[PDB]
C-alpha cells in the first residue's frame, strides 16, 4: 500500500538473494587463500564480479524508494547503506582510471624492491626482507639504509599516482552530498534518527582531538623513557632533548614499538613470562590450542564452536603440497559457516593471537540472526576491538596459571607488572599518536586545507610536533613518505586502529567491574565469570542494527568515547615513569634535526 | 496382513519442495510406531495432542504423511500456532492439530557440492495459507499498485525462491527432511491400529 510495505518487501527479497551470491564470493576467496592456483583465480574473479554486479544492480532499484516516507528505523538503516552508489556515480571514463590507479599502487607496494648500488643484481623486497632488517639490526647505517631506500624508490613511483588519486575520490564524495572525501570515511560513525543519541560526522574530529589531549601525559613520559634507554646505545646519533630518529623506532614506519622491548625492558634480570618452553615439553598441537580457546568462551557463557567448524577449517599449513597466505583472518561466509585461517606454530604469541581470531568468530556468531545488511560491527572499531579484549584476558598471569601453562609458584611483584605493562604500552599506546597523526594528515589533504606542494612540508611538521619523531634525512617534494605504507596506498581507512584502543579499555573496565574484580585492572581475568559474558553478549548480537552510541551505553554505561579507562589501565606504569623521568627531560622541540649541525 | 509402507515415505531418495509438499494417504494397514521412536536416528521427534506411548495402541481411520524439506532453524516453525515464512506462506498446521512431527538430518544426501537449487520455497504470498492448503501458483507477486503483467520489474517479484544447500553450510542451515503426520477420526471405520 505504502512505500513502507514495498521497502520491507524489497529488503526481504534482497536478503535471500544475497546469501546465495555472497557465500559464493567468500567461498571462492577461501579456496583461493588455502589453495593458490591459477584455476582458483578465475573462480574468485567470476564470483567476485557476480557479487560486484549484484550490489551495483540492486543500488539502482534501491534509490527508487525514498527514505523520507519510512518511519521504521531498522528498515531505514538497511536502505541507507544500500542506496549509496559508491564509485558508480563517476563517469565511465574516470571509473576505469580509479581502479587502474588502485590496482597500480597495489602492485607497486607488493612488488616494490630496494636495490643496493654495490651489487645491483641482488635486490630485496619489504616482506620479509626489509621488515626483518629494521627490527633485528642494531646498526645505525643499516637501519637507515632500509629506511631511505624503501621510501626513495616507492616514494617516487606512487607520488604522481597519488596526486591524481586525491582529485578522483573528491568528485565521488561531492556527488554523494559530502563536504569532502574524508567525510565519507567519517560517515561510518554517523548517527541520526534518535533524540539525544545523534552523533554528527564532524563531531568525530572534535572528539578525537579532545581524547588525544589526555593521552599526551602518558605518551610524553613513554617517549622520555624510550629516548633515555636508547641514548646509551646511540650516544652520538640521538640527542637527549630532541626527537627520536625515525628508523630507530623498531620497524619501518614506527607503527609498533614492540621491537624495542628488548632494549627498553625495565628489568633485565627478572624472568619474562613465556609459555613456549612450557608448551613444547607438554607437546601441544594445533588441536589442543583452540580447545583451550573454545573452553574460554564457554566459561563466560558464549556458545562454543560448531561441529562443522573443526571439519571445514584449515588450522595449519598443509605442508608443501599447496601454498597459502599465513596472515590470520577470521572468515564469516554467512549461512552459519565460520572458518579461521591460520598457520599454526607453537608460541606464546600464537596462543594470544588464537583468542583474537576466535574472538571475531564469537562476535560474528552473535549477530548471525540479524538480516544481511545489518551484519557487521556496530561501528568499524568494535569488530576488531572485541577480539582484543580476549587477548588481554589470555595474557594475564592468572589465566596462564589456570590452564596449567605457567608454574603455580611463579612469584608476582612490583617488578613483574611494570615489565608486562611496558610491552603493552609500546604496542597499544605507541601506535595511538601515529594513528591520530596519519588520519589528521589525510583529513586535511582531502578537505583541501593543504596545497599539493605542502604535503611533505606539513607531514614532517606533524611528525615532529605530534609524535615527536624527526627525519634522519631530509626529503624534498619528490618523495611521498606516507604512500609507501600498506593502508595508505591500499585505500583502507586507518582511523579504525585508534578507536579500537579507546573501546577495548572501556570494555575492559566495564566487564571486569561486572566480574567484581579486586585490585588493578591489568590483573583482571574474565574467565569463569558469567556476569561479564552476559553483559558483553547484549551488544554482540545487536550488530549495526542499532546505533553504536546506543549499544555502547549498554556495555560501558556511557554515551561518549572516553579515554579514562586507558589512563586507569596504565596507572601503575604512569606512576613509575614519573619517578624515573625526574632526571630526564620531558617534551621535545621541533626545531632540531639530525641533518642540521 | 500388511505393514503401513512408511519405508517408501522416509527412505525415498527425493522429497518435494516445501511449496510442492507431497501428501500420501495411509489406510488399511497396521503401522509400528515403536521402530520409529526406538530407532534414535531422528534429530527432532515430537507429538502434539497424543503421547507416543498412547498412539502405539490406538486406532485412527486416517493417517496423512506430509513430507517436505526446509531449513534447520525453520523446523521450529512447524507446529500449531506458529508464524514466519514457512508457517504462513508454505505449510500451515492448525491449532487443534493432533499429529506428530518428525525431522532428521538430510545433509548427507540433499546438499551437494556447489549447491542444489531444485529445493524451493514461497517467499511471498498475498495472504496467509489456511490450514493444509497447497498452492503451487507461480504467479508474479504484486508488491504495489503497479501492474506486473507477468514480467518481473519494479515492485514485482517472482515468489518461488530456492534454497542453496552446500554441504559446508552451518548445521542450522543444513537441510532437514520433515515428515508431518496427521491423525483424525471421521464417520468411516478405523482400519489402522497398533
Ligand atoms: C589445490 O589445487 C590444485 C589445482 O587447482 C589441485 O591439483 C590440488 O589437488 C588442490 N589441493 C587440495 C588439497 O585440494
Ligand atoms: C521495523 O520492521 C521490523 C520488521 O517488519 C519490525 O521487527 C520492527 O519492530 C519495526 N520497527 C518499528 C520501529 O516499528
Ligand atoms: C558445544 O556445546 C554443546 C552444548 O553446549 C555440546 O553439546 C557440544 O558437545 C559442544 N561441542 C563439543 C565439540 O563438545
Ligand atoms: C575456572 O574454574 C575451573 C573449574 O572450577 C578451574 O579449573 C579454573 O582454574 C578456573 N579458572 C580461573 C581463571 O579461575
Ligand atoms: C529405512 O531403511 C533403514 C535401513 O534398513 C531401516 O532401518 C528403516 O526402518 C527404513 N525406514 C522405515 C520407515 O522402515
Ligand atoms: Zn582481528
Numbering used by the authors:
A (entry chain A): 19 to 615
B (entry chain E): 333 to 526
Sentences from the paper on this structure:
The Kappa variant also harbors multiple mutations in the S protein. To uncover the structural mechanism underlying the observed binding property changes, we carried out the cryo-EM analysis of the Kappa S trimer in complex with human ACE2 PD domain. We also focus-refined the stably associated RBD-1-ACE2 region to 3.8-Å resolution. For the L452R mutation, the hydrophobic to positively charged substitution also reverse the local surface property, with elongated sidechain, thus affecting the binding of MAbs targeting this region. We also found that, for Kappa S, the E484Q substitution modifies the surface property, leading to a small outward shift of the T470-F490 loop which may affect the interaction with ACE2. Similarly, for the Kappa variant, the E484Q substitution reverts the surface property, and in addition, the L452R mutation (consecutive to the Y453-L455 region) results in a change of the nonpolar L452 to positively charged R with an enlarged sidechain.
The spike (S) glycoprotein of SARS-CoV-2 mediates receptor recognition and viral entry into cells. The S protein is also the primary target of the humoral immune response during infection. A large number of SARS-CoV-2 neutralizing monoclonal antibodies bind S protein, especially its receptor-binding domain (RBD), providing a basis for vaccine development.
